[PDB]
Amino acid sequence: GDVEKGKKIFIMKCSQCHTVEKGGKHKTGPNLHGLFGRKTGQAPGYSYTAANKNKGIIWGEDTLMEYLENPKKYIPGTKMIFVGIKKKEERADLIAYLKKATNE
Amino acid letter for position 25? K
Report in angstroms how near the CB of residue 38 gets to ligand HEC at its nearest: 9
- Residues in the interface with ligand HEC (CB under 6 A) total 25
Q: Does 97 bind ligand HEC (CB under 6 A)?
A: no
Q: Does 78 bind ligand HEC (CB under 6 A)?
A: yes
Choice from 24, 52, 93, 97 touching ligand HEC (CB under 6 A): 52
Residues 6+ apart with CB under 8 A from 67: 59, 74, 75
Report in angstroms how near the CB of residue 100 gets to ligand HEC at its nearest: 14
Name the site residues for ligand HEC (rule: CB under 6 A).
13-14, 16-18, 28-30, 32, 35, 40, 48-49, 51-52, 59, 64, 67-68, 75, 78-82
